[PDB]
């Protein structure tokens, strides 16, 4: 239809009034901006002059009616928190938004039995009526026609689930910073979307009023500083820090020597002019690294100033410290896709849905009056369109995987433009992929830069147990990486000072005999550390504390570890080597930022320790290698050995699938149970690995060399066990099979005690292992080992956040929970007095 | 010259020699998978998965049984198609070890023209070049032709060809 847009007339005798009308408004009723112009007939060259007084307020008054649902009042403080009204999300608003931006992601479409989610771009729909209210205040005076949107950014809060349909989202907005540049005034806004009290996501928006502002009394700037690290190696560095009035520790005599301090500061500047701050107010907590890499608040910064020319906190931290960058760049960017998208013919649909009824994107006259090249495309449309390309290509058409997304509006886009967006995987941050992009127009001019943060696909970390441990493992990584260096060095130092050997040496060149000498002050100290180690085990409800290293006493001047092929295959050195190597590997992965904040983790047998140290940081390196060595050394003594370091115990990797397809793991559990009862010796299933393809039975090498020959007879004669207990003589067959066991009982008994196990048909014997790990045999050494951990795993290092849901113990293959049902499950399969006590007294802990 | 479809014997011997990163003559055809690889657990499933994807089917217990009779039983059902991964190994040899332009269709046309060798013989030449893969890329084009001046006599020595 045809409507009036402009009405030029004479308000008075010499006041030309050019009413400019917007016919696309909230409630149908058109909104007029009465631009005035003095007409002076004496100045015949320029008879018309603009009335510049009350000009910016007329404009604002228009845009208020176009944008805000409240009464017109420009008298409120910019410092104060702007409170947007609650927004209820409906399936029609999402439907209309997604078509308006061309985001055809099945997450936002109504499918049966699956609730509709709202795109994260829908945050600017919710927040626009608050965020844009941040540039109205009288103190933030500007011409809204010249207003430029420089940059818009979203950031989901970690944990918080994406927006749904039927969610009542509250909005807060606040001006972070408003600074007069030479070329105009920048207004940085920080909207917060909130659902059921809990904040959901942050929206950042930078606006630019072009012009010349000198109202510096109304400006400010709340910057957040990059984290600065410091290494207090010397006592000069302690004295320099003690000089600084702003370095305020909670404890005055806290020992800063050989410590790492982090300085998480946020500044609050107010300006006097362009280059002089009228009030600097840098503050923030001072954290110290613990030996678990956990940081704890020990102090504060409390710098305050009047007139200044700089922040002497930031300056000092720069010169005398290093920045911690969370964004780690890959070696080479990885191209993902190059994509073409088209801006729409008309901007009316995006204006309708978003609520951004800025005339410049719809009315040719307003765009012409603001010196724009025609009805420009909404920058917020380009943003949303590119974010839907990122979502489809980088996040493989999953919404939930997009956790942040910024974009700078470099240049204006006209309608019916064809855009080429290059998308690159350039970096990592906290396990989220860092994807840069760059949108160009047909002139090959950059129009929209930006970067997205994209979760990695659901990850789990599994840590290997005492399998293979070939020499030089992790040493290629220990040469290159800096975090692996830090890990090995720490352990090797603790091992040299404590037990007088180098683990690094042992891993590198795997010596056959390693002699520890107890000469000197250091020598006697090390020899005490060897003699202190005990083998506390329970017999008949009575402690029989044998002392490990019985030969090491007050008068001994040495001790030698023996092996056959090498000491890296001896348990007490395999275990610390393996654990360290894993921990190093992980610490390299974490330094690179490849570790999801929400990754599940488990560890097979030994791995469980490495896992917990890696993911949960529940132990220090020093405490880890202490525990894993002591356990390793307890396993060298938990079985009677010989004079080289070999025992009459070991493990076989049974493959019940290989003997017979009928031979299910029940018939495997049956036969191993029967061979153990018969020969009296130890047989038991210890590792349930792959189903009907790999189980591991540990026990007495002779009793395991009978089972590998009992299951090398069933294969050759294809004689079933289930089809005899079901369809034949019931229960009798337990007496039949005793002859087959007793056949191998008198070839294995004759054989020597260090007998080599022969790779059978469906059984392979493992290598390195000589102790029946995970068996009942060593169940006795659990009650005093429990007590050993209690002074190593200190409760101040146990973050429940980092274990709950993600950790899967081997004991109870179930995500670790601090719920009563989990305790009840632990007790019901491991009769413990302290666990039963916690179960019975569960109520008082709740309070 | 005279065309001949590729066998399952040179493909099986080459794929194993490429996997172990060793010369074809170093590995005997006579020995079995488990004796040659020596214990190392993961590599058996990788080789079986390999013999599963080119040949489509594998015997009941191929790991312990020798390679000469695995080439016997694979030739029974073999059609003359090199394999999906055998062409994928030749896709990464050409793209990563030959210079900027020496593609698969120019190393096809050189053996066809200079030597005369047709597709059934050139497919046999390309497999012997894989188990004699150079450590790095040959920068010059004249070394990508002097390399292909070597693998024509080695194919001929193995199978029997006059050039």
């Amino acid at each position: 239809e045809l409507k009036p847009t402009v009405i030029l007339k004479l308000l008075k005798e010499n006041i030309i009034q050019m009413e400019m009308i917007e016919n696309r408004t909230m409630d149908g009723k058109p909104v007029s901006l009465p631009l005035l112009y003095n007409f002076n007939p004496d100045n015949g060259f320029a008879p018309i002059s603009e009335v510049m007084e009350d000009r910016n307020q007329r404009i604002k008054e228009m845009y208020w009616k176009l944008w805000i649902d409240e009464p017109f009042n420009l008298d409120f403080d910019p410092r104060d928190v702007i409170k947007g009204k609650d927004f209820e999300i409906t399936a029609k608003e999402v439907y209309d938004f997604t078509h308006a931006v061309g985001n055809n992601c099945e997450d936002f479409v109504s499918r049966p039995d699956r609730t509709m989610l709202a795109p994260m771009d829908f945050a600017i729909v919710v927040g626009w009526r608050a965020i844009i209210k941040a540039i109205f205040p009288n103190t933030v005076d500007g011409d809204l026609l010249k207003l430029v949107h420089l940059s818009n950014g979203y950031k989901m809060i970690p944990g918080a689930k994406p927006l749904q349909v039927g969610d009542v989202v509250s909005t807060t907005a606040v001006i972070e910073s408003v600074v007069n540049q030479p070329t105009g005034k920048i207004v940085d806004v920080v909207g917060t979307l909130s659902r059921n009290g809990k904040p959901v996501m942050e929206v950042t928006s930078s606006f630019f009023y072009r012009g010349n502002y000198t109202d510096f009394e109304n400006t400010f700037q709340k910057t957040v500083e990059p984290v600065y690290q410091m290494h207090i190696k010397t006592s000069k560095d302690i004295a320099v820090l003690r000089s600084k009035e702003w370095f305020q520790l909670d404890d005055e005599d806290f020992d800063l020597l050989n410590k790492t301090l982090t300085f998480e500061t946020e500044t609050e500047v107010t300006f006097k002019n362009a280059n002089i701050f009228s009030s600097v107010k840098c503050f923030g907590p001072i954290k110290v690294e613990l030996p678990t890499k956990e940081t704890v608040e020990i102090g504060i910064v409390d710098y305050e100033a009047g007139a200044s020319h700089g922040n002497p906190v930031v300056d000092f931290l720069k010169r005398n410290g290093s920045t911690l960058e969370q964004k780690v760049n890959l070696e080479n960017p990885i191209p993902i896709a190059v994509l073409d998208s088209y801006t729409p013919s008309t901007n009316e649909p995006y204006a309708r849905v978003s609520g951004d009824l800025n005339p410049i994107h719809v009315s040719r006259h307003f765009a012409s009056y603001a010196n724009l090249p025609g009805t420009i495309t909404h920058g917020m449309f380009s943003s949303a369109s590119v974010r839907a390309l990122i979502e489809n290509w980088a996040a493989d058409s999953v919404s939930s995987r997009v956790r942040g997304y910024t974009c700078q509006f470099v240049d204006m886009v006209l309608p019916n433009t064809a855009l080429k967006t290059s998308i690159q995987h350039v970096g990592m941050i906290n396990g989220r992929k860092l994807i840069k992009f760059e949108t160009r127009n047909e002139d090959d001019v950059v129009v929209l830069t930006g970067e997205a943060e994209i979760e990695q696909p659901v990850t789990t970390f599994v840590f290997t147990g005492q399998g293979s441990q070939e020499q030089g493992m992790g040493m290629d990584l220990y040469k290159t990486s800096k975090a692996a260096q830090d890990v090995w060095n720490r352990a090797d130092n603790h091992f040299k000072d404590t037990y007088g050997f180098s683990i690094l040496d042992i891993v590198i060149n795997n010596p056959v005999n390693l002699t520890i000498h107890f000469g000197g002050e250091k020598g006697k100290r090390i020899r005490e550390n060897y003699s202190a180690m005990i083998f506390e085990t329970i017999v008949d409800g009575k402690l029989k504390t044998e002392k490990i290293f019985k030969e090491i006493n007050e008068h001994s001047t040495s001790y030698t570890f023996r092996s056959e092929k090498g000491l890296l295959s001896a348990t007490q050195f395999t275990q610390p080597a393996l654990t360290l190597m894993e921990k190093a590997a992980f610490e390299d992965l974490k330094s690179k930022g490849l570790i999801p904040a929400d990754a599940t983790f488990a560890g097979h047998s030994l791995g469980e320790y490495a896992a917990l140290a890696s993911l949960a940081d529940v132990m220090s390196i020093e405490s880890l290698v202490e525990v894993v060595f002591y356990r390793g050394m307890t396993m060298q003594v938990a079985v009677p050995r010989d004079e080289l370091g070999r025992s009459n115990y070991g493990m076989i990797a049974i493959n019940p699938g290989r003997v017979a397809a009928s031979f299910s793991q029940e018939a495997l559990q049956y036969v191993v149970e029967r061979v153990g009862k018969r020969t009296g010796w130890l047989v038991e299933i210890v590792n349930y690995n792959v189903e009907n393809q790999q189980y591991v039975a540990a026990g007495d090498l002779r009793a395991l060399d009978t089972v590998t020959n009992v299951l090398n007879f069933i294969k050759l004669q294809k004689i079933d066990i289930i089809e005899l207990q079901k369809s034949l003589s019931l229960e009798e067959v337990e007496g039949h099979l005793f002859e087959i066991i007793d056949e191998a009982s008198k070839k294995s008994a004759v054989k020597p005690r260090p007998l080599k196990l022969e790779r059978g048909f469906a059984c392979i014997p493992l290598v390195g292992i000589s102790v029946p790990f995970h068996s009942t045999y060593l169940m006795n050494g659990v009650k005093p080992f429990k007590s050993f951990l209690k002074k190593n795993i200190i409760k101040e290092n146990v973050k429940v956040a980092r274990l709950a849901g993600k950790y899967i113990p081997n004991l109870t293959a179930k995500p670790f929970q601090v719920t009563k049902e989990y305790f009840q499950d632990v007790y019901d399969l491991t009769g413990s007095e302290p666990i039963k006590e916690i179960i019975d007294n569960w109520e008082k802990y709740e309070q | 010259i005279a065309d001949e479809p590729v066998k399952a014997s040179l493909l099986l011997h080459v794929l194993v020699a490429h996997k172990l990163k060793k010369s074809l003559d170093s590995i005997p055809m006579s020995k079995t998978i488990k004796d040659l690889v020596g214990g190392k657990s993961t590599v058996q499933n990788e080789i079986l998965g390999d013999l599963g994807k080119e040949f489509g089917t594998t015997p009941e217990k191929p790991e312990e049984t020798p390679l000469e009779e695995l080439a016997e039983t694979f030739q029974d059902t073999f059609s003359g198609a090199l394999g999906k991964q055998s062409s994928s190994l030749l896709s990464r040899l050409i793209s990563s070890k030959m210079p900027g332009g020496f593609t698969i269709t120019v190393a096809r046309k050189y053996l066809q023209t200079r030597w005369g060798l047709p597709s059934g013989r050139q497919d046999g030449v390309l497999l012997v070049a894989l188990s004699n893969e150079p450590a790095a890329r040959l920068g010059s084009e004249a070394d990508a032709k002097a390399f292909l001046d070597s693998m024509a006599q080695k194919y001929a020595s193995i199978v029997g060809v006059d050039l």
Binding site: E331, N332, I334, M428, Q456, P457, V458, T459, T460, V462, F463, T464, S468, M473, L578, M581, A585, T600, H604, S605, G607, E608, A610, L612, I685, N687, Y688, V690, E691, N692, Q693, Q694, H774, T776, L778, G781, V782, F785, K786, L789, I793, K795, K799, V800, L803, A804, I808, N810, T812, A813, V818, F823, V826, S832, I838, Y845, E846 | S41, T42, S96
Partner: protein, 94 residues
Amino acid sequence: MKPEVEQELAHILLTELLAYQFASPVRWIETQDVFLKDFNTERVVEIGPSPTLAGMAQRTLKNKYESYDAALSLHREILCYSKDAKEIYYTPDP
């Protein structure tokens, strides 16, 4: 449950989890069934010198999740740290 009480209980559970784990069978079947079926993990990154647990996953996936992986059309990558550095570190060959 207060945070300082939850910390204490967790520290007890963890202590008496490691204590028994030592001397109670490893239930790595149920463990795989959790992190492969329950959590629908895509990337299974194995940290260690050889791909033993990677090998165990890859074999468990073929044995009892091939029809489940096909149905829900999810592409389970199994990466060992030893042999698949380039896929874990995102460093492909140009």
